[model samples]
Target: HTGYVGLKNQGATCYMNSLLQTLFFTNQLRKAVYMMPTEGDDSSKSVPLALQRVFYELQHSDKPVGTKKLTKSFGWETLDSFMQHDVQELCRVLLDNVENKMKGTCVEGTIPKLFRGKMVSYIQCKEVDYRSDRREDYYDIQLSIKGKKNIFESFVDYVAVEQLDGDNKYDAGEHGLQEAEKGVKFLTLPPVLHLQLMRFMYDPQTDQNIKINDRFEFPEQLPLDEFLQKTDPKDPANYILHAVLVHSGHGGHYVVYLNPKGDGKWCKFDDDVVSRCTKEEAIEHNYGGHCTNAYMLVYIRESKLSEVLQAVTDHDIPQQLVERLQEEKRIEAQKRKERQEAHLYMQVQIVAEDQFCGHQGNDMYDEEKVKYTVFKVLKNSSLAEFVQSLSQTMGFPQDQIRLWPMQARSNGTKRPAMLDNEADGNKTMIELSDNENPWTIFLETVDPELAASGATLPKFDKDHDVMLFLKMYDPKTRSLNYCGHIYTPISCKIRDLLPVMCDRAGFIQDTSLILYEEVKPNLTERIQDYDVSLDKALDELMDGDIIVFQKDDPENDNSELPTAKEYFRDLYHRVDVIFCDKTIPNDPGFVVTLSNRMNYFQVAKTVAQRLNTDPMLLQFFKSQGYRDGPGNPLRHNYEGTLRDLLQFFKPRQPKKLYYQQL
Candidate 1:
C-alpha cells in the first residue's frame, strides 16, 4: 500500500512540490546532489546541504516529507506575497543552484551533460544571401499550445519560418535591402529534456493574464532527430517520457504523475497526498482544454534512460546527513506529540508589576523587578469562575483583579497588550490567554473607583492605542528613513503627540515636524491637518504602517540644532557597513549610525576613514555577500544624498553595504 511519500503544500508551493518529485526521481541528478562537497560547510547557509536532506528523506521517510527545510534554505522569505508562479522557472533556478555548487567539483559535467541543449536561430536573406546567426544553450523548450493540438504541431510552429520581405526589410551590407527568412532549429539535444505547454498568455479582454486551456497532446516516444540539424542517424535523438506535470485549477494548484523507471507506470503526487493512476488518467486527461491539464513534460533520452534510472544505494549518501535528518525527524515527531498533549490544558505565568511589596514567593520565582504566578488551568473553563475564585481568595472584587495578556517591547521585554473585551467573562481561558499556553500575563489590582461594574475600564486596545514605528523624510536625500518609534493613543491629539516625537527625533522641542503615513511600500499620505485623531488619519492600521516625518521651516531660517555629537549621531537609524575584500575574503566593516543630512561622498569618506583609506579609489556595490557575486554598483546618480543612495533598502531594515576599490 505504501509507495514513495510526497510533500506538504505550504499554501502555494504545490507547483514546487510536484516539480521537485520529478527532479528527485531523476536518479543521476539526485546522486550528484548527494555527492556534493559539504564536509565542513555550514548547512545553516548551504542550499545543497539542505537539498540533500530533502532528497534523502523523500527517498527514505514513510510520511510525506515537508519541503519547509529546503524552502527555508532556498529563501525568498516573502513566499506568501507571491500568488502566481510556475514550476518550469523554479526548475531552472533549482538546476542553476545545483549547477553553481557543482562547478570545479568532480560532478561538474553532470548538469550540462544531462540537460543542456543548443538552439540555433538565424535570418537568411534572399537577394544578398547574407546571414545573422545566433546560437545559445537551453535547458528547456517552450511550446505554444494556443492553436496547436499536438506536441508535433507545437514543435512545427516553434521552428516555423517567418517572412521579413515587404513590410520589414533586412539590412544587407552589399545590397541596400533584401527579403529574409527568419527561422530556428535545434543544433543539439540533451539526454534530459523539458517541454513547457504555454497555457498562460494575456487575453487582453480582461486586461489581465489568463490560462489558455486549448487542447494539446504529447506522446510517450518523442523522436526529435528530425527537428535537429544534421543529427547522426546512428545516435538518434530519441526520448522516453519520464514525467508529465499538470497545473490544475485557476489558482496555482499543481500535481505530478511521474514514471520513476522510464516505463508506463504512473502515480499522482498531489503535494501531501499520493495515489495510483493509469497512463490514460496521466496522459489523456492532461492533454489541455481541461482543468488539471498537462503543463510541463519531461523526457529522458532513450539511450541514457537505464543509466539515469539506476537504483540508489546507502553508500551514495553520507552517514552524517542521514543521522542529522533522523535526529530532526525525532525532534519533529516529539514536538508534534507535545503539540497534541497541549490540547486539554493551558499554562499561564501571571505577573505582578512591582515585587518590592514583600509578597513571599509562591506561584513561581519573583525576579527582583516583578512578581509571578504560574500554573496550568483548564483551557475551555470559564474566565468569570476563575476570576471569582482568585478574588475570593485574595479578598478583592472580581472586577478589581484584571489580567492584561502581555506581549513584548522592541527592546526585549514584556508589556500589556491590546485585549478589547477582557471583561466578557463568558470567554474561555484559552481565549483570554495571549494565543498560547505558557503565555505572559500581567495581574493588576485596579482601584474600585476607576473600575465600576457598569463603566468600561480605561484599557488600551486596538481601537484606542497602538505602538507604531517612526521614520523621518530627508528632503535633502529625498528619502524616508526610520528614526524612532512611538506608543500613542488613537484618541490622542496629533499636536499633543508632536512634541514627544520631536524630543525622540532629536529636534528642538517646539520645532515643527510634518507627518506622512506610509500607506504602502513606496506610497505615503501626508497629514495636512494636525487637528484629527491618529485613528481618523490612519484608519484600520494593523499592517505595520509607519508614520514618517519631514522637519518643516516656513522661511527655511531656523538655526536651532542639537549638539554636533548629537545631530551627527544616528541613534535612531544606525547602519553597519560590512567589508568583503576579494583579497582577504573575511574582514568585518565598521558600524556607522547614519545621519540623513550627509551626502554619499561624506558617507563614503566616513567608511574610508574607519578603514584608514582614501575616497579617491574606494567604491561601493550592492552585494548579497554570497556567491551571486558583486551586484548593482553605487553609481554617480546616487552620490548626492546618503539616504537617497540607501533607498535600495526600506526603513528600519539591515544594510548589505559591500565595499571595494578600483
Candidate 2:
C-alpha cells in the first residue's frame, strides 16, 4: 500500500486540504516544519507546533487526518476557508503563521529562503538622465492568464515597458517633465515558486467573478532565465513543476496533483481520495480547458530538486517535537473522550446575585453581557459539589446561601421556580430540569442586613410560589428603580401582592398605585386591573419579569406617559444638532433628539424655526458619525423619513446638521 494519506473536506474547504497536501508533499517544507523549535510553547499558540503535528500525523497515520486544528492554530474558524483558490490567502497565511511562530528559532528564515522572489518597478526617463525605480520582495507571483498563453508570455507582458509620453510625461523634479518607459522586471526567482493563475475574472456585465476556461499552457519545466535581468549561465533559472492546484468549476471545488518525490510518477490529491495519475491526467487535463482547471502552480528550481525533494525519514524530525506532539495528542484524546461521553457531565448555569444584577435583558442573561460561567458537573453529583464549584468562582463561603431553580420561559426570559435546599441535594439537575442543558439556577445571596438584624427571610412553597423582580417608578424623576424581588403564590391575588410590593419599594400602603411590567430596555406594559390572580394578571410573565409601580397621580396621566417617554428615549436617536451658516463656521449644532418617525425635510423645518428662516429656503447638510467627519448634503434616502437616515448619522453623541439659507 502507498503510505500516502488524504484529507477531509469539512463540507467546503478542499482549497485548504489541497494546499496543505501540496505543502506537506513539498517534502522540503515538511522537514523544515518538523524541525521547527516548538518545545518552549503550548500546542494551541505555536503554529509551527500545530503544523508539525499535522505533518507528523499525515506521515504516520494510516487513515485520513483533519486539518481543522491546523486552521485552529491561526485562531480561525472552519467555515472561513473560502479564498482566491488557496493561493492569495490560505497558503500565504499558513506560511506566514509558521514563519511568525518560527521566529527567534533555528527554523527562522526557512520560509523566505525557499519561497521569496525579487522584482523591481522602474520608470526609465527617455529625455533625461533621471530614472525612478524601486525593488520589492514577493513570495508568490500572481500571473494573468486572460491574454497570455503560457508562463513566459505572462512574464513578458508583466515586464513589458509602457510608453509614458505626451500627457503621461514623467515628472523628473529638477529635470522637469520627460518621456519615460515604465514597468516591472524580475531580479531573481526563488527555488520554491508559487504561481497563482488568475482563474476568476470579474464580469463587468454582471457582478459575477466568472471563471476563465480558455487554454493557458504551463510547461513541465519553466526556463525563467529568459526574462531575468541577471542570471548565471552556469546555473540558470529553471524550475520543474511539482504541483498543480486545480479548481473544479464555477461554484466549484479544489484539488491538487502532487509530485511528492519529484519523480516521473504523479499523484492526485483530491481531498480524502488519494490516487495515482498519468502525466496527461495530472498536467494536460488541468490546462484551463475543462471543469477542473489549474489555479495555483508550485515549481521547484530544477537544480534544487535534489535538496527540495530529498527523501524525508523519521530521523529528519526532531525528537522533542515528536514527544511534544504525543503529549498534545494524549490531551486531545482525553478532551475527545469527554466530548464523546456527553450525557455523563451536565452543564449548569449558576447566576450569582451580582451577575443577575448586571444583566440588562428580559432574562437573566443579556447578549454576551455578564459573560456566564457555566460549570460542568456529574448529573448524579450532590448539590454540595455544585455549590463548591460556584464558591470557587464566587469566593463566597458556602453558608446561608439559597438556591432558586430557574427556567427560560417562552418569551426568552429565565424565570425562577422556588428555593432549593441541601435536604433535596439527592436530586440532580438532569432530574430537576427534566433533562435540559442551559438549566439556570439563580443564587439568592443574603446581604449584611440579613445577618445584622436577623430578619426572617420571606419563604415560598415549591408547589405554587415563584420569585419576580419589583421596581419603583419615581413620578418626579420619571425613573424606574429596582427596589427588590418578591416571592408570591401563583394563586395569590394582585391586590394582595401590592401591600407587600409597596413596602418593598417604599411606597405608601393603600395608596392608589399603578403597576407596569418591565420586559426589556425601554419596554414596559401596564397591568390593567389589580382584581385578578397574580398568574392571570401578569401577561405571560416569568420570574425575571420586572413589576414597576408608581403612586397614582390625578394631576398627571400616570397610565403610560412615563413608559411612552422611555420608549421614545430608546427609539428616538439623540444627536447634537449643528446649525452651519455660510458666514464662516456657524454656532455649535443644536443638541436635539431625532425619532425615526421624523424625516430630514421635517428636520429643515425645525432648523428653519431655530434660524428664523423659511422651511423651504433652509438647506440641511448632515455630517459623518465621528467628530470632524465631513458634512454632505442630506439627499435621497438620507433626506427621506428618518428611521433609515436619522439613525444613520446620529451615533452615541448628537449628530450635527449644517443649516444654510438656500
Candidate 3:
C-alpha cells in the first residue's frame, strides 16, 4: 500500500435520479459549464472543460448542514402504480413462500431499515421507482430512509451457477431467475448492494441509535479515500467522512465508506502568555490535520455533523438531551467524535419482490412459454367436419369446439351449413339461424335474355324477407363494380333484379338492355387499378361469390359465435356495401359500407325504422336542417363519404386533405 500514490479530486458522487440517468440533473451541470467563454471559437473549448469541472463539483455535494429540523413527509401512495400494487403483491408472495418453507434456500428479510437510538420504525416495503445507470427495473421495493425521503430499491438478476447438489451430484451450467421454476435460470444479486438491508433487517439485534460501526461492511478496496473522499483538500478541517458498518455472518461486518481524512493535532504554549510562568498552566492551543488527497476539502464549509447523522437516521433520530455532555471525558469524546469524521453509511434490505425475482441458488422456472392463438377458418366446408378434423390433428377434445358460440345473441349471424332436404331424409339440417339464410349475391350486367324475359315476366321482388342481388359495372374497363344495391319493394321485380345484377356483373352483352336503365359506367384509367371481368362478374353465381358471410365460428360446424369488435373493424375494410337485405322497402337509403358498417349498424337501424312509418313524409327531412333539401340520398347510398368525414374533423384531418387547396 505504501508504494501507491493517491489520486486527488478524481472521485465524485452525484445524486443522479436513476430514472433516465442523464437528463434532469446532469443537464443542469452541463449548462453551468456551457456558461463559460463569452464568444468566439474558444467558447466551445471552454464550455467542455467547464462542464467536466462542474460535474466533479456536484458529485460530492453531500456535506453536512448542521442539525436542521427535518419534518418533511412522504406518502407511500406517491409511488407509481406499477411499483405499488404489483410490486407489493410480489413482495408479499416472496415473503409468504419463504415463511412457509416452500423454498428451503436463499436468505430473505422483511420491513428493514437502519436507524439511530431505537428501532423506531421500518419501511412498509413500499413500491419503489429507481433508475440508475447501473440498474434499471420496474416494481422494485423501495425503503424510505433518513435523508430527505431517499430510497433503497431492489430487483433480481439471473446468473448461471455450477455446484454440487444435496444428493452429492455435481451439476453445472444451470440458469434461473424465478424461485418457482424447476430449472430455468439461477437468480442472484447483480451487484454487491442487493439483499444487504434484508440481512440487516432480519437480524434480531438491529435497533435505532445504531452507531456508524453497526450498519454496513467497509470498503474492500485500498486507499479508503476512494470510498470516503470526493472533495478538493484546500481545507481538510471542513471535510466530514461518512461510513456505514453492518453486522455480517455471525461476527462478520460489512463496511461501506463515504468520506475520509486525518485529524488535527493540538499544541499549547502557556508559559509565553504569562510573563512569569506560574503553576505551569496550559494555554494557547493549536489544532490541525493533513488530507493525503487533493479532493479532501471541496465545498467543505457547507458540512455539519448533526445534519449528516440525521440524514442517515432519516426519521429515527430522537431529540438529544440538552445537558447530556456534562462529564469532562464525555465532552472530550464528543469533540473527538465530531472531529473523528467517518465515511458513508447505507442500510439496504432484500427488495421484497427481488427475493422471488432473484435467483435463490436453484435452477428454477425461467423458460420462454410459447403462446399461439388458434384461428379456425373454413375454406369452403361444414363446421362439424372441419372441427372433427381439427380436433384429431390438435389432440384436443371435440367438445372444445362446442365451447364457442356460448351465447344466444350469437344466433343472429349467417353461415353455410349442411342442408336437410327431404330428398335426403338422413341429410343434415342446414342450421340456419336468424342470420344464416339464402343470400342475394348482387351481380349487375346486361343479360339480354334475363332482361327481355323480365319485362315480359313477373316482378322479381318478393316480401322484405327475399334477398336481392344487384350489380353495377364499369364497361369501359370491362370491370364489375360488384357494389350496386337497390331497395326491394313489396313486389317480385325479377326484371329490376336481373338488370341490376347485370350492371354489377359487367357481363351483359346486350347494349339494348343497358340503354334501358341509362346508368353511367365506371372506367379504370390507371394501371394500378384492379378490375373484375365482365363475364365472371356476370356469372357471380359460384358458391364463394355468393357467400353467406357470417360472424360465427365458421369452422365450428357452422355454430354461431359472438363476433369480436376487431373482426367487425376488419370486415368494414373488406366489403363495399351492406344493405338491410330484408323483405320490406321501408327504408330505401339505409345503406352501409365496409368503413362505416359499425357506425351505421350500431346507430342507423332505429333512424331507418322511424323513417319507415311514414315513407312519403321521409323527404321532409330534406328541408328541416339545411339551407337546401338534403342534397341527394343517392349520395348517401354508401352510408358516409370521405368528404363529409373530413368536414367534421376539419383541422385534425391530415395536411393531405387540403392538397391543392393549401
Candidate 4:
C-alpha cells in the first residue's frame, strides 16, 4: 500500500475514480503509461497522456487528486452516467482509448499484452457433416451468471457449447433442424484476466433492469489450465486474484479491494477513503445475493506479479524520470518492498478425524480443530519455522504437532489424506512450492503409539485456505428438516451421498430413496418453484446448494421443469408498440401495435395508412429534426423485423416517432 494514493470522488465521479484506482494497482499498466513519450500533438485528447498524469499524481500526492480532466478527455460531458456507469464498460472504454492513443507508436501498450484475450467458436453442420469456425479477440470477458454459483461456474457457462439452428442454403437439409452445437473456448489468456460479472439483467416481467443478488464465490487463485490451449498439470494456472471492483447497490456506488503486489494485505479503495480489509471481507463480494457484489475482477499471473512490479518500479519507471522523481520512486519501491516483506498470512483449516475423539457425535466431535485459522509467518521463513511460529501463537506444544497439507477440491470431496512426505520425514510448509491449489493444514499428534494402534492421522492434499454446507429438506415436514455437512469431492454424485445424508438424518437407506435439489433463488424463483433430481454428481451442484428427500411418497414425481425465461417466451406473443407524432398543429401522437414478426415494409405500410398519405411518399422519422417536412428519415429494415427497429431506437415505452415531409 506504500505507493497507493486515493482519488477524490468529484460528486458522482466515484464510479470512474474507483475503477481508476484498481487499474493504478496494476504496475505493468502504470509503468507502460508512465514511460510513454510526452511529446505528441494529440496530447490534448490522449487517454495515455491523461493516464500518465493521473498515475504520477496518485503516486506523489498525499491527498486525492481531481479527475475532471481525465473524465473530460474520455468524452464524458455530464456527470449523470459517470456517477453510476458500469465498471466493465468504463474499463473497456478507458483501455480502448488508451490503446488508440498509442496505436502507431513503437511501444506496444500493455493493455493488449496484459489484458487482451481471444475466443474461438467451433461449429459443425450435423446433416452435411460440413464444419467451419470463427475467432474473435476480446479486451474483457463478460461472464453470464444465469445459473452460476461461483466464478468457475460462470466461466464454464461462458464456454459451454450452444446448440444453434442452421438456416443457410448450404445446410438447408438441416435448416429448421437442430444444428450442431458451437464449442466456444478461450484461444488465449492475457497476463491479466479482466472478468466482468453480468450481474444486471433486464426483467421483462418488471419492465426494468434488475441486479442479481445471488451469491457468487471466487477463489484467491483461479485455475486457467482448463481454458488454456495446453493441458499441463505441472504448469501453474498462473492467474491469481489481486483486485476486486465491487458495486454496493443497483448502479449506486462503487468501491475497490486491491492487493497491488499480490501480498496478503488487501486495501479497500472507496473514493477518498482508503482502509485495510481482510480477504474474508473482500470475499464477501462473492455473496452478491443482495447489495455489494464484485462487479469487475482483476487477476494477474503469479509469476509475472513480481516481475511486473520490478520492471515498473525498479527499472523502467526510474530510468525515464528526472533525478528528483527517480529518487522519489526509488524510495517508494523500497518502502513497498519493506512492507511486503513484513509477513505473509495463509489460511489453514485443521480437521481432526476420529483419532482425536472416539465414537463422537456430530456437533460435539472435534469441535476445536475443525476451523479455519490464519497463520502469520515471516517472509523467507522455513516450514519448520512457520510451524513453530503457529504452535507458539496457538498455544500448542510445538514438538507434539505435525502438519499435513490438504487441498479443497471443487467437486466437494474430502481433502486427500496425506501430503507428499507426511510419513517419511514430513516436509516443512515453506518446503512446498506455490501453485493453484489452496493449502489446508491438518494438525496431527506426533504420538507413534496412537498412530500404530488405529488412530487416523491428518494429511495434506492441495490447499484452500473454505465452505461445503449441504442442507436437506424432508418432504414429510414440508420444510427444511435435515442438515448435512459435506466436503468437496464425493459431493459430485448424490447416489454416493444418500448414505451420508441418511446417516445424518438418522433414517435407513431403503426408507428414503429419492433426493431432490431445490432450484429456487438459483435456477428457480420460488421455494417450490421446482426441484431437479439430485441423482447427478455432487460436483454438478455448487456450495450451499440445497437438496430434499421424503421418507414416504415413492409416487412423488420430481421431474425437471423448464426455466422461467423459456416458459414465458412461449407464454406470450411479443409486439412492438410505437407512438407516432406528426409535427403539425394539435397533433397528438397516434399509437400503433406492430407484431414483432412484422418486417419494416409492413411497418411503413401501417404508418402510411395511419397518416392518410401515400405509402411511397410518407417517411418515418425517429426525431423531429426536419424543416419544411425535410430531415433525416427514420429507418425501417424492409427485410428485417420491427424488433430490430425497437432495438436500435430504444424509444420511450411505446416507442415514439416524429414525422415530417422528406
- State which candidate has the highest TM-score: 2
Report the Cα lDDT for residue 286, model 3. 6
Model 4: per-residue Cα lDDT at residue 480: 39
The CA root-mean-square deviation of candidate 1, after full C-alpha superposition on the true structure, stands at 15.2
Per-residue lDDT over 382-477 for candidate 4, one digit per residue giving the tens place of the 0 to 100 score: 666666676787656655565645544444333323343434334434446353233556565545566446554333233331123334434332
TM-scores vs. true structure, each candidate: 0.57, 0.59, 0.17, 0.47
What is the Å distance of residue 116 in model 1 from its true position?
A: 0.5
Q: Per-residue alpha-carbon lDDT of model 3 for 1-662, expressed as tens digits?
A: 12111112111111101111111121322232223332222312332222222233233223211100100011122223222322224333322332333122221121111110111111111122221122222212222222211111111111112332345432221421211211112111111111122222222366622322222121112121222113246422232212211222322221121222211111111111111111111111100111010111011112332332222111121112112212323765787786544211111110111121222111111112212223333223344554455457644444322211111222232211222222332322133222222211111122234543433222232223222222232223222232322334423333334444444445453322221111111111111111332222222221111111111223423322222222222432333322332233343333333343333233234334644532222221111121311222321234644333323332322211110000
Instruction: Report RMSD for candidate 4.
Output: 30.0
Using lDDT as the measure, name the better of candidate 2 and candidate 3: 2
- Number of the candidate with higher TM-score, 3 or 4: 4
lDDT of 3: 0.23
User: Would you list the C-alpha lDDT of every candidate in the order shown?
Assistant: 0.71, 0.73, 0.23, 0.60
Of candidates 3 and 2, the better by TM-score: 2
lDDT of 1 by residue, 229-326 (tens): 87665688888999988876646687889889777888888888988889888888887664668888999998888888878977888787777767
Best by lDDT: 2
Q: Model 2 Cα displacement at 469 (Å)?
A: 3.6
TM-score of model 2 relative to the true fold?
Answer: 0.59
Over 4 Å off, model 3: 1-86, 101-523, 526-662
Let me know the TM-score candidate 3 reaches against the reference structure: 0.17
